[PDB]
Structures are given as structure tokens and as C-alpha cells.
Design a protein around this motif. Structure first.
Motif, short mmCIF file in Angstrom:
data_model
loop_
_atom_site.label_atom_id
_atom_site.label_comp_id
_atom_site.label_asym_id
_atom_site.label_seq_id
_atom_site.Cartn_x
_atom_site.Cartn_y
_atom_site.Cartn_z
N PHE A 38 0.84 -1.15 -0.08
CA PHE A 38 0.09 -0.02 0.08
C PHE A 38 1.09 1.26 -0.23
CE2 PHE A 38 -4.27 -1.91 1.14
CZ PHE A 38 -3.87 -3.16 1.62
N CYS A 41 1.67 7.18 1.98
CA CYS A 41 1.19 8.46 2.08
C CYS A 41 1.91 9.06 3.28
CB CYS A 41 -0.26 8.57 2.14
SG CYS A 41 -1.26 7.80 0.87
N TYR A 214 -6.65 7.87 -5.59
CA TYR A 214 -6.86 6.57 -5.40
C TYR A 214 -7.34 6.04 -4.01
CZ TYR A 214 -3.95 6.64 -9.53
OH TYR A 214 -3.55 7.03 -10.68
N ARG A 216 -6.85 6.56 -0.93
CA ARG A 216 -5.97 6.11 -0.03
C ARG A 216 -6.45 6.58 1.27
NH1 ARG A 216 -1.51 6.43 -4.89
NH2 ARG A 216 -1.26 4.29 -5.29
N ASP A 238 -6.99 1.47 0.09
CA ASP A 238 -7.21 2.07 -0.83
C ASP A 238 -8.48 1.56 -1.74
OD1 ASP A 238 -6.34 -0.26 -2.31
OD2 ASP A 238 -4.40 0.63 -2.34
N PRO A 248 -11.52 8.69 -0.40
CA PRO A 248 -10.73 7.79 0.89
C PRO A 248 -11.78 7.51 1.87
CG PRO A 248 -9.35 9.36 0.37
CD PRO A 248 -10.34 10.16 -0.51
#
Length: 265
Positions: A38, A41, A214, A216, A238, A248
Motif C-alpha cells: 500500500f 502516504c 485512489y 488512499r 485504498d 478515501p
């Protein structure tokens, strides 16, 4: 049946969900897609602060960093207000963790030095903690924006949980530097609707969030039961099926944390 409930969460929220809680002397590991990649971020900002703390004396926290308006990138709730004055390394750590400040993160990456604006050195720091999987390749905000399938700027729930375990509960840092990192995570202002929301109020929660394109949404935490028993919790998600603009879902993180708390009780 924990797996079935995480799968039902994936369907309810139309998401991919990843969960890891390391084993303790009295509980088995909890894992769900725990070895799938993943995007970090902003969760990387927590070990980033550890890396800065680890490589310098405490007196380094008072070193002042100056920067300009052109240096301000991505979400920056703090750095914008200190352009004229600069910010110390310590203030940058505070901002990077408690407000997820992207310019602060970029400045700390630069402080680590080396190629890729500090990203290679950051990945090196993770290697020193036995994490061979994670990698950081871009700074903010580009790191929130890689396409699904790109391994760049990714970790796994398993990997980040074991990193956080060493930093907060283990001996990766000496007690004084460990307390500073713990305290910033304890006073985080961005995770009220995630892991914290999924745990009853009488459990202590320290955390660092991550949010991206996306769909996330991540949160990594250390929690303590009402009698002081600690666990590490990593939740990542995600929604690649919705493309770049997918929203999200913080609620999914909170529900997964409730399922976890029920097993830990």
C-alpha cells in the motif's frame, strides 16, 4: 472469522483493506492482506522523525532551518506561517507528525541528506530496523500520487507495524528521543476519525495518519488497554477501482479498528 469480517468491510466500503497487529506474549498476530503493498502516504513521517532523531544529538533539534515560499508544497498547515522566521528541526518534527505537514517532511528528508532529496537515506533508515520491503522515492506531494501497482513509495501493514513497534515499544531509540517521538504521536491532530474512533475512549491511542489519491487512507498506531497492555495497529486502505479521484473512506479504518479492539479485549 476475523478474516470474514474484514472481507465484509471491504465489500461494505468498496475498498481494499490491509491490517496488521504483531503477536504479543499472550495474543497471535492479526493479519489481513498484511503482506500486500500500500502507498505510505503521510505515515512515513513518523519513522522519518525517528530517522532524524537517531542520526543526530538532541542539540540538533534546536538547529534553525530557513526556507522560502517556493519551498512550500502540498498540505502545509504549519510551515506557511513560519516562512519569514524559519523553523527549528524540533518544530519541523512536531509539525510533520502532529499536523502531517508536507513541507516540514520535505525539509526533514533534506536534513537526512543524500540522493533523491533524502529518500534513499530514509529507506536506509528503515533497512537498519530490518524492514526490507518498504521504500520511499519522491517527496510530498508526489509520494501520494503513484498509480496502483507502482512499488514506489509503498510499505505493507506488516512492515510498518514492526517498524513502529521498535520505535515506540522497542529499543530503536534511546529513552529521551523515544519519549519525544511518542509524545508527538500522542498529540496528533489528524487521526480522530480513524483508529482512535474505533477504540473505546479508555484505551490510549497514539497515531500517524496518511491520506492520498485512489481513495488512499491509512493510520498506524500504538494503543494501550485500560490496564496498560500495549499493541501496535496498522490499518491501510485504498480504492483503486475508482481511479485517481476515488474518495478515501476514514470510516472503514474506524470500523476495522473496532473489529481489532474486540479481538484484543
Amino acid at each position: 472469522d476475523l478474516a470474514d469480517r474484514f472481507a465484509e468491510l471491504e465489500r461494505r466500503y468498496d475498498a481494499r483493506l490491509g491490517v496488521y497487529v504483531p503477536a504479543t506474549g499472550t495474543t497471535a498476530a492479526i493479519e489481513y492482506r498484511a503482506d500486500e503493498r500500500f502507498a505510505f502516504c503521510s505515515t512515513f513521517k513518523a519513522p522519518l522523525v525517528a530517522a532524524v532523531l537517531h542520526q543526530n544529538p538532541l542539540t540538533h533539534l534546536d538547529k534553525l532551518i530557513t526556507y522560502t515560499s517556493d519551498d512550500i508544497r502540498s498540505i502545509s498547515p504549519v510551515a506557511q506561517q513560519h516562512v519569514q522566521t524559519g523553523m527549528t528541526i524540533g518544530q519541523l518534527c512536531d509539525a510533520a507528525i502532529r499536523y502531517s505537514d508536507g513541507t516540514a517532511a520535505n525539509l526533514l528528508l533534506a536534513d537526512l541528506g543524500g540522493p533523491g532529496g533524502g529518500t534513499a537515506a530514509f529507506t536506509g533508515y528503515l533497512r537498519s530496523l530490518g524492514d526490507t520491503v518498504s521504500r520511499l522515492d519522491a517527496e510530498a506531494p508526489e509520494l501520494n500520487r503513484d498509480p496502483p501497482g507502482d512499488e514506489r513509495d509503498t510499505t505493507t501493514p506488516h512492515a510498518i507495524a514492526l517498524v513502529l513497534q521498535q520505535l515506540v515499544l522497542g529499543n530503536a531509540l534511546p529513552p529521551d528521543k523515544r519519549a519525544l517521538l511518542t509524545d508527538w504521536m500522542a498529540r496528533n491532530t489528524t487521526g480522530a476519525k480513524r483508529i482512535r474512533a474505533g477504540f473505546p475512549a479508555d484505551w490510549k491511542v497514539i497515531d500517524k495518519t496518511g491520506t492520498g489519491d485512489y481513495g488512499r487512507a491509512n493510520d498506524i498506531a500504538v494503543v494501550w488497554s485500560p490496564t496498560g497492555v500495549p499493541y501496535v495497529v496498522a490499518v491501510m486502505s485504498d480504492r483503486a477501482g475508482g481511479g485517481y479521484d476515488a474518495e478515501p473512506r476514514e470510516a472503514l479504518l474506524a470500523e476495522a479498528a473496532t473489529c481489532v479492539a474486540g479481538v484484543l479485549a
